[PDB]
């Protein structure tokens, strides 16, 4: 042990008392009862560091503590007495900066009115849905506490081995058991560890660190991602670029942690090429940042020219500013966002010399990558600081850091090697050959018309929702739960899971077992997914309903859909679905651009549909005309022309929604279209005829 | 200041909206075909001596558009569900009308053109098989493109005017006096893409191989510069076209 590891692990385990009390074990306050749990655990196995770490649950004179510390002979671990007093005091203040029955569950950050069933974080099991408030059974905590105890018993007592097990088991546990408590315990634990280690490297036995700018909020954001990824000369290469940007990002974050002597707990988030880190405000740090910021940029310029930039900024922040008074954290994030906007208008300014594809082809059966030195054998790609050696199933990992994909379980990696869990939405349809499906094979798998389906989806006004977070630990929960929806559960949504949660969605075929879907990216609050056009059309409604359940119906998606000839270049498909996502956004948000559409340019006619509006229309008209799985209804086999005529009729409403001829031209099949609805004309809204093409055009595509 | 607006009236659709480097290139070419290099050399000298031309911008009827100064991006906080929505739509805007451009220079509130006088229609065609796209620029009624000239009239009459007629023979040319009211200031927007000499205040990089500062970028007393180079002797235009701009402190 050394103060740095101690204060980290300490901040992390300060509140491990909570799960033990809520199980019926030590008959004492969470504080004293958490002490009993680590001491008892330390005595079992025979690892005395746990009994050193036990001193965190019980804390504020301090006559007893000084002597209780003495009895645990510190020199044994290479520690001073005065060292442990500061570690304990730091972590005590740190707990209050991150910041009643005992059966109360975690209430959803998305909807504080609803709450999470107790479950362990597993992306292969059921989708987290905020539902009705149920008291958690005392058995469920006791079952948690025993696996929790059996895991800590076999873990290496390094924050990188402690974080994953605390995240597996304390993700869906209330940090405090009040009504409407929004904060995951795991997040409160990692943020106290983050804030504590920051105060240590701050130079604090001290309210000096609380009322003085001793912390840095460090925000990093890649600029030109959309260009770097979707402006090529093939789906394989597109996925390689996307994967390459994830490693380039990690290579920067891990560097920052390594050179500031910080732990992964200090990473508030790292989603969609956007990271935030709480760190020390020593002049040794700002220099250490300035060097990193500069060498990263200089490498990006040499590697891709002006295509991909990294905007890194930081801000002196005090303990006051992690908190509320009369909301300063938001205020501090706002001041920092401003710095990032300015830095993005000074792209590659950190160069003064500015004003005078075999390795990625190679990039299905790998477990992760080793962050080794740039000149190491087996290095398959390089970031601005380190080489990445693919860690394969039958093989040994190589490097100081192992990045491990879609587990919180180290598995068989060496004890010396730091575990970095990284989640990536990487679903793909397998071809006849073992490799990922081509745009061609995806398009060929379509019901009816052979077009490739493309959809870009994004959460509405997330920045606004995140701005409403009071504390580091609140933001940590919001950030992670959000990122996890896309990185974790979109695979499950695609597989056909959450059938009862999802329900009836617009659909053209029975959902396949191995759907003709390939994920390009799914992270932050957005996704880019391609596949057979009909499977893509349906997946949009599945993902929106999943997301409606996962939020408390309190947050919204907009989606842009596109159906292209399989020969259309990526840059054009990206551009069209982007244009259509922006349109959905710009016409109200909570809407979907289903299909390209003619309309009056009179500023009364939206191209987009409110999700519920389109879902209603499909429920109304599709069953009357469409049998399923590529087939019209029997009545309409010889009368397929009436569908085309309704579209030709809708065009004579587009020509002029005032010329009343479309009354003249008009059946017992579509009754609500024959009339001239007046509520619509009065409310200054379109005629029902305007909306129907949204359904018919999709059904005509399915039946060709 | 007042400037000559060179209005390009299009007789058909366009490929690019030409920027200052491409405009100077074209004019330099035409002048070589009319008067020989002797004249090209006198053109460069006039420009090096203080003459300037903007990049081309769209005009609609009797409305001139100008590039959104990057000066306002960090000022946009100068209904919370009106604030976020509208601020994102300004941040996308490439162009303001003259009136609103002049307001943006002084950091006073301004509004965006609702419709822009050109749509990009890129047309697909199948080849041999694959899909390729040729970007074309379609113009509304009495809409087109223009650039500004600052400098002596003798240089305009003798070089710019003749060159622009020659270049038309796809378009016809007409010119009118134009006034842009701009605050006096340490700081300025370029109405042209530039090869900067100093490092600039706010900017967008623009890759062509040369690295240009985009139209709308902000410099402090940066004239930019011209470059000569050999490849079978051609001059590359990268001079700034400055109008004074009020900056917010930050
Ligand atoms: N690895 C990735 N693969 C694909 N898309 C990604 C990846 N990481 C981030 N993205 C997405 O890229 C988009 C950001 O593109 P970017 O070009 O940086 O524009 P921006 O976020 O609007 N800001 P700006 O820096 O001004 O361009 C977001 O939708 C991210 O979710
Ligand atoms: N899970 C996440 N954790 C932290 N930051 C995130 C996360 N997802 C997205 N962001 C960031 O949140 C910011 C806002 O998201 P963005 O998609 O750009 O727009 P928005 O604020 O959601 N509004 P809009 O998409 O236009 O309706 C960006 O800087 C993203 O990088
Ligand atoms: Mn970005
Ligand atoms: Mn968003
Ligand atoms: Mn987004």
Give the pair of three-digit tokens for residue A167. Answer: 């995240």
Contacts of A569 in chain B (CB under 8 A): 130-131, 133
Stated as kind and residue range, the H or E segment containing A228 is helix A225-230
- Confirm whether B249 is domain-assigned: no
Experimental method of this PDB entry: X-ray
Helices (H) and strands (E) in chain B, counts: 6, 16
Burial class (CB in 10 A: 0-12, 13-18, 19+), A295: middle
Contacts of A349 in chain B (CB under 8 A): 199
- Residue pair A239/A436 in contact (Cβ under 8 Å)? The answer is yes
Q: Which domain holds residue B87?
A: 2-244
CA dist list (Å): B177 to B10, B103, B180, B220 = 20, 21, 10, 27
- Residue pair B211/A354 in contact (Cβ under 8 Å)? The answer is yes
Q: Where are the beta strands (DSSP E) in A414-556?
A: 418-422, 452-459, 517-523, 526-532
DSSP assignments along A307-338, one per residue = SSEEEEEEEEE-GGGGS----HHHHHHHHHHH
- Confirm whether B250 is domain-assigned: no
Residue in A338, A345, A463 closest to B203 by CB: A345
CA dist., res. A622 & res. A608, Å (int): 19
Cβ atoms within 10 A of the Cβ of A72, count?
17
Q: Where are the beta strands (DSSP E) in A107-256?
A: 215-223
Please enumerate in sequence order all residues whose Cβ is within 8 A of that of B88, keeping only pairs 6 or more positions apart, or say none.
none
Stated as kind and residue range, the H or E segment containing A371 is strand A366-372
CA Rg value for chain A: 28
Name the CATH code of domain A439-614 (choices 3.30.360.10, 3.40.30.10, 3.30.70.270, 1.10.1740.10): 3.30.70.270
Ligand 1 pocket test: pick from A226, A251, A340, A424 the residue with the most ligand atoms within 8 Å of its Cβ: A226
The reported resolution of this PDB entry, expressed in Å, is: 2.7
- Confirm whether B15 is domain-assigned: yes
Count of the separate structural domains present in chain B: 1
**Do β-strands A401-405 and A418-422 pair in parallel, antiparallel, or remain unpaired?**
parallel
- Confirm whether B136 is domain-assigned: yes
Closest Cα partner for A123 from A425, A537, A533?
A: A425
DSSP assignments along A632-683, one per residue = E-GGGSS-THHHHHHHHHHHHHHS-SSSTHHHHH---S-GGGTS--HHHHHH
Please enumerate in sequence order all residues whose Cβ is within 8 A of that of B189, keeping only pairs 6 or more positions apart, or say none.
B67, B69, B70, B71, B105, B216, B217, B218, B242, B243, B245
User: Which residues approach ligand 2 with their CB closer than 6 A?
Assistant: A 269, 271-272, 274, 458-463, 479, 482-483, 524-526, 585, 589; B 88
- Residue pair A495/A513 in contact (Cβ under 8 Å)? The answer is no
Angle among Cα B170, B173, B178 to the nearest 5 degrees reads 135
- Confirm whether B52 is domain-assigned: yes
Ligand 2 pocket test: pick from A310, A336, A525 the residue with the most ligand atoms within 8 Å of its Cβ: A525
- Confirm whether B229 is domain-assigned: yes
By three-state DSSP, how is residue A164 classified?
helix
Instruction: Give yes or no for A302 touching B (CB within 8 A).
Output: no
């Amino acid at each position: 042990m050394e103060i740095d590891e101690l204060t980290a692990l300490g901040g992390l385990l300060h509140d491990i008392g909570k799960p033990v009390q809520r199980a019926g074990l030590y008959s004492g306050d969470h504080s004293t009862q958490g002490a009993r749990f680590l001491r008892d655990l330390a005595e079992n196995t025979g690892r005395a560091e746990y009994e050193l770490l036990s001193l965190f649950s019980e804390f504020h004179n301090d006559e007893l503590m000084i002597r209780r510390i003495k009895e645990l002979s510190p020199e044994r671990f290479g520690l001073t007495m005065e060292d442990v007093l500061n570690a304990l005091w730091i972590v005590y203040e740190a707990d209050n900066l991150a910041s009643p029955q005992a059966s109360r569950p975690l209430y959803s950050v998305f909807n504080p009115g609803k709450a999470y069933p107790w479950a362990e974080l597993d992306f292969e099991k059921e989708l987290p849905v905020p539902g009705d408030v149920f008291s958690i059974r005392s058995q469920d905590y006791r079952e948690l506490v025993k696996r929790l105890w059996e895991e800590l018993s076999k873990a290496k007592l390094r924050s990188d081995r402690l974080l994953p097990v605390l995240e597996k088991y304390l993700t869906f546990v209330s940090s405090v058991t009040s009504e409407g408590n929004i904060i995951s315990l795991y997040d409160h634990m990692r943020m106290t560890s983050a804030i504590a280690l920051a105060m240590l490297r701050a130079g604090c036995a001290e309210g000096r660190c609380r009322k003085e700018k001793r912390f840095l909020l460090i925000e990093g954001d890649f600029s030109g991602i959309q260009d770097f990824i979707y402006r090529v000369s093939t789906l394989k290469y597109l996925r390689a670029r996307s994967a390459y940007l994830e490693l380039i990002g990690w290579d920067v974050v891990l560097e920052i942690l390594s050179r500031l002597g910080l732990t992964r707990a200090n990473v508030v988030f790292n989603a969609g090429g956007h990271f935030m880190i709480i760190a020390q405000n020593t002049p040794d740090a700002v220099k250490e940042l300035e060097e990193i910021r500069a060498k990263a940029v200089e490498w990006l310029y040499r590697e891709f020219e002006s295509d991909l930039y990294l905007a890194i900024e930081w801000e002196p922040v005090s303990g006051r500013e992690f908190g509320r008074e009369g909301n300063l954290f938001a205020e501090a994030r706002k001041r920092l966002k401003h710095k990032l906007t300015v830095r993005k208008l000074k792209r590659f300014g950190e160069i003064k010399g500015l004003f005078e594809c075999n390795r990625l082809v190679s990039l299905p059966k790998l477990l992760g990558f080793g962050r080794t030195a740039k000149n190491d054998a087996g290095v398959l790609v390089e970031g601005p600081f380190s080489g990445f050696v693919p860690y394969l199933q039958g093989g040994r990992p190589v490097g100081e850091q192992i990045l491990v994909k879609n587990t919180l379980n180290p598995g068989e990696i060496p004890e010396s090697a730091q575990f970095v869990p990284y989640f990536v939405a990487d679903y793909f349809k397998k071809d006849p050959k073992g490799g990922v499906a081509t745009f061609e094979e995806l398009s060929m798998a379509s019901t009816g018309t052979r077009r490739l389906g493309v959809m870009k989806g994004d959460v509405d006004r997330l920045g606004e929702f995140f701005s409403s977070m009071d504390s580091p630990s609140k933001l940590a929960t919001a950030s992670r739960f959000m990122d996890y929806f896309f990185k974790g559960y979109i695979g499950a949504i695609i597989e056909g899971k959450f059938g009862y949660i999802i329900g009836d969605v617009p659909s053209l075929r029975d959902w396949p077992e191995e759907p003709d879907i390939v994920v390009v990216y799914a992270g932050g609050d957005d996704f880019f997914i391609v596949g057979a056009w009909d499977q893509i059309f349906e997946l949009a409604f599945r993902v929106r309903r999943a997301f409606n359940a996962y939020t408390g119906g309190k947050l919204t998606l907009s989606v842009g859909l596109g159906y292209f000839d399989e020969r259309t270049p990526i840059y054009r498909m990206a551009d069209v679905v982007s244009e259509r996502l922006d349109t959905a956004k710009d016409e109200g948000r909570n809407r979907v651009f289903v299909v390209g559409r003619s309309r009056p340019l009179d500023g009364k006619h939206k191209l987009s549909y409110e999700w519920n509006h389109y879902e209603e229309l499909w429920r109304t008209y599709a069953p009357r005309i469409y049998a399923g799985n590529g087939r019209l209804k029997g009545k309409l086999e010889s009368k397929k022309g009436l569908l085309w005529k309704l579209l030709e009729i809708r065009e004579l409403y587009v020509r002029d929604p005032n010329d009343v001829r479309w009354a003249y031209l008009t059946s017992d099949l579509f009754p609500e279209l024959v009339g001239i609805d007046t509520k619509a004309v009065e409310r200054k809204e379109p005629q029902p005829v305007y909306w129907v093409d949204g359904v018919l055009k999709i059904v005509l595509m399915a039946v060709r | 200041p007042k400037f000559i607006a060179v209005k390009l009236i299009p007789k058909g659709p366009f490929r690019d909206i030409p920027r200052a480097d491409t405009l100077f290139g074209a004019i330099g070419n035409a002048i070589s075909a009319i008067h020989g290099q002797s004249a090209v050399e006198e053109l460069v000298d006039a420009f090096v001596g203080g003459a300037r031309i903007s990049s081309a911008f769209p005009y609609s009827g009797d409305t001139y558009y100008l590039p959104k100064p990057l000066s306002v991006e960090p000022a946009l906080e100068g209904d919370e569900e009106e604030r976020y929505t509208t601020a994102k739509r300004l941040r996308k805007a490439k162009y303001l009308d003259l009136k609103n451009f002049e307001l943006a220079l002084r950091l006073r509130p301004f509004t965006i053109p609702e419709e822009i006088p050109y749509a990009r229609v890129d047309v697909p065609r199948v080849v041999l098989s694959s899909i390729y796209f040729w970007e074309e620029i379609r113009f509304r009624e009495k809409s087109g493109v223009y650039f500004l000239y600052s400098g002596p009239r003798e240089v305009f009459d003798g070089y710019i005017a003749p060159a622009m007629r020659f270049l038309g023979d796809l378009f016809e040319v007409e010119f009118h006096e134009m006034k842009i009211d701009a605050p006096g200031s340490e700081y300025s927007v370029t109405l042209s893409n530039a090869l900067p000499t100093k490092t600039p205040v706010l900017w967008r990089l623009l890759r062509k191989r040369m690295t240009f500062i985009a139209e709308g970028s902000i410099v402090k007393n940066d004239p930019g510069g011209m470059e000569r180079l050999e490849l079978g002797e051609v001059y590359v235009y990268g001079l700034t076209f400055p109008l004074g701009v009020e900056l917010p402190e930050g």
